[PDB]
Design a protein around this nucleic acid. Sequence first.
DNA 1: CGCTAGTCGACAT
DNA 2: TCGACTAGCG
Length: 348
Amino acid sequence: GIQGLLQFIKEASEPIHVRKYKGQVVAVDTYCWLHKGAIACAEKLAKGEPTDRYVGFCMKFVNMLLSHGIKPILVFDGCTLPSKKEVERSRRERRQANLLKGKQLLREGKVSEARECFTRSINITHAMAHKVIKAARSQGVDCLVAPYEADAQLAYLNKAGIVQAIITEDSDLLAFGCKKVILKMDQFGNGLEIDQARLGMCRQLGDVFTEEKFRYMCILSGCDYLSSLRGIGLAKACKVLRLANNPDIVKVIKKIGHYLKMNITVPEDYINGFIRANNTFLYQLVFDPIKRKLIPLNAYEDDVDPETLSYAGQYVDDSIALQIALGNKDINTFEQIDDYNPDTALYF
DNA sequence: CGCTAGTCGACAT
DNA sequence: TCGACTAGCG
Ligand SMILES: [Mn+2]
Ligand SMILES: [Mn+2]
Ligand SMILES: [Mn+2]
Ligand SMILES: [Mn+2]
Ligand code: NA
């Protein structure tokens, strides 16, 4: 996510209860629940010892939403995004490192720290996610496996008007241009909501409350697709966008040092990386549940060439995309591991 | 002082 | 894929 974004725009936030959305549809970034539930059994997950606790943990929240008359759509991550491979590598390295370290501390004698290491080695696999999918489907809850990041999928579901709000712990969804996002929701329904249109309640943002400029700010501050320049965070990026009054962003990015009264040399590849990051936020592939078709998050504008956007996710056949979305197709082996059919009585 | 980057408990049961 | 907290910076 965008580090400290929630704190930066805290004025646009509002404490709520999910009963606000009774008789409505809400999409869920299920990974958060999955992780929080996986914490309660980190050791057994690390050792490979069998446990299905995260399932019950997620189903608690699901049953809560269902109890408050909410129609929940559980969304899951799919294939790895090429423009996110660095962060994936780092995360993986941290995971195996902390795993081995914990395994060592188990032999040393210190379990209190070994457990804490096992917490950092949490690896949420597609199998666990599929268990959760099984449970949710047994409780009549619609599930959707994103072709890539669940973030973009949720953003699409919200923009398309399929869902009214998004439940997540990740502030990336705001950069994607979600309308309504519910952060920090507990097991009872208490949560914090940020509306896009209410970003203007943040005086600190200045005139950076439009989707495009807000996105630019989030990218410049540092995201999962492009690391920020050293010494650059939300405040300075927002300052850059505030002080500058130019339509073309590239020139401003080239004058970032000028706008911040600093000596900031911008590498040539950083501009290209910014273009790539922007295009990743705008055009990352998602799955249209209605038309059952792979589409970019936003329709391609005239100023972009879709053939250069491989990093935003590659296209596959719509039937394969469908089988992935249903969770029937294994992400890694591309083999069919289930036979769920929505026609045999979200997908029309 | 304001802001960024990095650490470690919390996460949760 | 978190965030309070804070060393340590300009
Ligand atoms: Mn993120
Ligand atoms: Mn794929
Ligand atoms: Mn995500
Ligand atoms: Mn994200
Ligand atoms: Na940054």
